[PDB]
RNA sequence: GGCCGCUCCAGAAGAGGGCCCCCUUGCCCGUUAUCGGGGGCUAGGCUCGAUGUCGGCC
């Protein structure tokens, strides 16, 4: 029975000067061995909090955490800009050290729909016997977003992946990217391909399509 | 003044092996407690290995044990970490970490520094450079005066690929997003740029896709129906 | 039966021990190492002991 601690949200969103509070729970009782990480894309941790509620060297003092129970809070009072990250709390209570699945800090703006876009698989691509359709959602937020893809009006399923941009610097929104891979025999079978977009920031969903030729 | 530098992670195929180390400066290794961690793509963080140097002492997570091995040489202030057998589940960004030791503590603390990280990847994919199709900008998928056009990177290995557009002339609205693991073990991935659509008659837009695993540099122009 | 003993057998047998909860390690303690006290639970599973329903000798 390895120790798990389990954090939530998921994920956050939040503006400059506000105070934000992060969750973890252990599955059971871990006195005060606690310890609080944050972590950018792509580099290393850095340790913020130890032992629940002490303050490494170094890390400023809007950082701070508290236990209640098995509850493990970390709070940022007054969040600055270069706190949007992913924080990830841990136990050494007991081995094996167990990490939670991390809470990413996100910025907050206002809601924005996505422009959405289809592109047919390149007729290069139609001879080397795959179609992949690919379908962009661009410069939208929040970044919860669904894409449906529809072949003549047939619901697909376990044929299509998705890949989503980071928020951008310069205007904090996301882009999603949605490939849906079809076999060229398939591809030739139907004629009318969508793609159904929802989105906090869409009335009513956006459908872009095509006729194969046509 | 503290630094840990990994090295030894790469590219190799199920049962093989790899040799992680971790070079450390601007503190004594005797004077810690070294950890392996690891986080997989889009992952959390999950223990490997730990081992204090002064006393010899190791300890493993029950999913490497027999498998990967941790080791200390206080005459290099370095650590490292044999890994035979490796599983294509093992590929991840291994970090290590000191603890730093306190003789008033009673026992080992927080990961109070990280290394920057060294990738592994296990697959038994082969090296290969991609297919680059154009993403062809529609006559029927305008936004506004605002046309999105782009090209699909299909079918390489390993990551990763660079991509720019014009020679990096154009910068401005473009988005290359992260690639995708195919079922096949090879990735994918777009770039896509928006652009005036009173543009698509006068400007040539040209992707220049770049996979130095493979020695492949494509460049392909984009065009409408 | 007497004497000796616990290697085998029993669980008929105590103590260590174990798990959980509180106390930021909090009498004294602490392997480069996670305790101690308090509370709740735990018996035949390990060590050590005891016993017979055991064994050895005469």
């Known amino acids: 029975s390895d120790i798990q601690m389990t954090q939530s949200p998921s994920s956050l969103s939040a503006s400059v000067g506000d105070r934000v509070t992060i969750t973890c729970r252990a599955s059971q009782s871990v006195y005060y061995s606690v310890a609080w990480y944050q972590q950018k894309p792509g580099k290393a941790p850095k340790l913020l909090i130890y032992?629940?509620?002490y303050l490494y060297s170094g890390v400023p003092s809007r950082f701070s955490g508290s236990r209640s129970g098995t509850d493990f809070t970390l709070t940022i009072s007054s969040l600055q800009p270069e706190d949007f990250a992913t924080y990830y709390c841990q136990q050494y209570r007991r081995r094996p050290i167990t990490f939670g699945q991390g809470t990413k800090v996100e910025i907050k703006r206002t809601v924005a729909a996505p422009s959405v876009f289809i592109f047919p698989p390149s007729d290069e691509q139609l001879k080397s016997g795959t179609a992949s359709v690919v379908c962009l959602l661009n410069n939208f937020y929040p970044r919860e977003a669904k894409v449906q893809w529809k072949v003549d009006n047939a619901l697909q399923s376990g044929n299509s992946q998705e890949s989503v941009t980071e928020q951008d610097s310069k205007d904090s929104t996301y882009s999603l990217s949605s490939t849906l891979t079809l076999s060229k025999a398939d591809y030739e079978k139907h004629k009318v391909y969508a793609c159904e977009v929802t989105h906090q920031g869409l009335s009513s969903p956006v459908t872009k399509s095509f006729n194969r030729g046509e | 003044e503290v630094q840990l530098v990994e090295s030894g992670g790469g590219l190799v195929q199920p049962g093989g092996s790899l040799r992680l180390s971790c070079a450390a400066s601007g503190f004594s290794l005797s004077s810690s407690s070294m950890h392996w961690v690891r986080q997989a793509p889009g992952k959390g963080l999950e223990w490997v290995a730990s081992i204090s140097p002064y006393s010899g002492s190791t300890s493993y997570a029950d999913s490497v044990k027999g498998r990967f091995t941790i080791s200390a040489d206080t005459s290099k202030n370095t650590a490292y970490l044999q890994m035979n057998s490796l599983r294509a589940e093992d590929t991840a960004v291994y970090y290590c970490?000191?603890?730093?030791?306190?003789?008033?503590?009673?026992?080992?603390?927080?990961?109070?520094?990280w290394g920057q990280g060294t990738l592994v990847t296990v697959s038994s994919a082969s090296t290969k450079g991609p297919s680059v199709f154009p993403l062809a900008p529609s006559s029927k998928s305008t936004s506004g005066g605002t046309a999105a056009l782009g090209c699909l990177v299909k079918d390489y290995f390993p990551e990763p690929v660079t991509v720019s557009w014009n020679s990096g002339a154009l910068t401005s609205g473009v988005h290359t997003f992260p690639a995708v693991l195919q079922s096949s073990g090879l990735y994918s991935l777009s770039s896509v740029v928006t652009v005036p659509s009173s543009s698509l008659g006068t400007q040539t837009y040209i992707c220049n896709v770049n996979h130095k695993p493979s020695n492949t540099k494509v460049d392909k122009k984009v065009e409408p129906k």
């Open positions: 970490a000191r603890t730093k030791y306190h003789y008033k503590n009673y026992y080992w603390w927080a990961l109070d520094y």
């Open positions: 032992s629940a509620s």
